[PDB]
Write a protein that binds this ligand. Structure first.
Ligand SMILES: Cn1c(=O)oc2cc(N)ccc21
Ligand SMILES: [Mg+2]
Lengths: 151, 151
């Protein structure tokens, strides 16, 4: 592997480790990965971090009833750009009616960007991904990894 | 007021807001500010963050029973360099006997560096500072801020 490939795989492993921990504990989480469409306007709504990715930091960010847990983490250029960011709520009538604002925010950003957003449900610990205006629900660990590698 | 001076003031405000919040809630914390003696050897024992400082991130790091809460945060200028770092334990007999490992680690690093370390007791909420081998306990909010401004 090249340095850039090794770095991408390390980031994927850090994300999946954090997501698994949160899914097991039913910790709600919202993590958007910026792609070609710039998301600076949304990054600017949160708390700046520009931090190295680690599973530890991702977990610490989303702990319930803490300063950083409300809102989205946005990743950009292999770093955590900001936490507690605003994302736009989707008005799509085709999202499962049992899902709340975390999932609607993820679908919303996916409607206007090419980003990939991961959501952990605080109700069930279920893991989902929003891309292109669609929500892919009840993902296995393998499925999430496949989506991150495809992305 | 140069940009350097304004950045320092912002960092002091972030630190003091976080410490005050953790003191009120008896959240144990151990926060070392590198000065002229480089602390790379200790930074490298922790989880790298290289993050912009915020009161929110400082608080999120020290929440009990989370990946990052045990060990020291080490700050370099206006960044959180790493969390969950090792510091050496002091054997000084002037550490109150009831105090635990955070205070002994803080005095320990203060014996071999010119750093300033802030400690919040999880037993009492009291705030202390270790510098040059001495521990100063039960600091008021005003005294801590004045110490940081002088540092
Ligand atoms: C480990 N953990 C978790 O899963 O939820 C938490 C909440 C708090 N306040 C502190 C720790 C945890
Ligand atoms: Mg006194």
């Amino acid at each position: 592997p090249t340095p850039v490939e090794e770095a991408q795989q390390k980031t994927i492993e850090a994300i999946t480790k954090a997501i698994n921990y949160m899914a097991k504990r039913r910790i709600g989480a919202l993590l958007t990965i910026e792609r070609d469409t710039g998301m600076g306007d949304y990054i600017e709504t949160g708390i700046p971090l520009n931090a190295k990715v680690s599973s530890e930091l991702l977990i610490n960010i989303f702990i319930p009833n803490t300063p950083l847990h409300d809102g989205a983490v946005i990743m950009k250029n292999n770093e955590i750009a900001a936490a507690a960011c605003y994302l736009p709520l989707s008005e799509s009538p085709f999202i499962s009616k049992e899902l709340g604002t975390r999932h609607r925010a993820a679908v919303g950003i996916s409607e206007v960007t090419d980003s990939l957003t991961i959501i952990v449900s605080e109700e069930t610990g279920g893991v989902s991904v929003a891309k292109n205006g669609d929500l892919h629900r009840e993902l296995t660990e393998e499925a999430l990894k496949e989506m991150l590698e495809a992305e």
